[PDB]
Amino acid sequence: GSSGSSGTGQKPFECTHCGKSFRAKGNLVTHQRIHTGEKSGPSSG
C-alpha cells in the first residue's frame, strides 16, 4: 500500500518494458533482468 507517487518527468534510464525508471544504467539493467525469459537464479542467501 505505497503512497502512489509516479510521473517524475524523464529519467536517464527507463524500463520501456513496464515503465520502471532509474538513476543509473546498472540499476535499471538489473531490473530488466526480471522481464527476460531466461532464468539463472542466485546461489544462496
Shortest distance (Å) from residue 8 CB to Zn ion: 16
**Type of residue at 41:** G
- State which residue, 31 or 40, has the beta carbon closest to Zn ion: 31
Which are the contacts of 17, defined by CB distance < 8 A and separation ≥ 6? 32, 35
Contact call for residue 11 and Zn ion (CB under 5 A): no
Contact 17, 9 (CB under 8 A): no
Cell 544504467, located at residue: 25
Contact call for residue 24 and Zn ion (CB under 5 A): no
Nearest residue to Zn ion on Cβ basis:
15
Which residue from 11, 12, 14, 18 is in contact with Zn ion, where contact means CB under 5 A? 18
